[PDB]
Amino acid sequence: DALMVMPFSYVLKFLKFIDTVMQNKTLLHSHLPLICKNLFFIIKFNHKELVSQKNEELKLQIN
Amino acid sequence: TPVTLAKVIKVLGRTGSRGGVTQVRVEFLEDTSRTIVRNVKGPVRENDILVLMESEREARRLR
């Protein structure tokens, strides 16, 4: 519910947060299933809008 | 003033909203991919259309 309440702008900055946090590989590996669960629910719930965004910055971010 | 129409895709649950007011997540009809979180007064369910006098405003909680 906490991930369903937040709008798509907060979803985009959540993706920025995940993109920064998997450069610090210390707290990536100590929170791998939490990051996986939250990130996959977020883009699975917001999949229709995410694949309609047109920005190569977010495309490179997702990659 | 030009008005816009927006179909409910998800009635948001477990938000801490004030009673008689329910948050809701609507996607537009002129571009049926982008959403916005609104919060409506009467009884609402999924895939029904509601009328936004503005769409430049995300909804917070009410409480």
Partner: peptide
């Protein structure tokens, strides 16, 4: 008193 979702949003 916020809740989950809006605490995560402001954070």
């Amino acid at each position: 008193s916020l809740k989950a979702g809006e605490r995560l949003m402001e954070a």
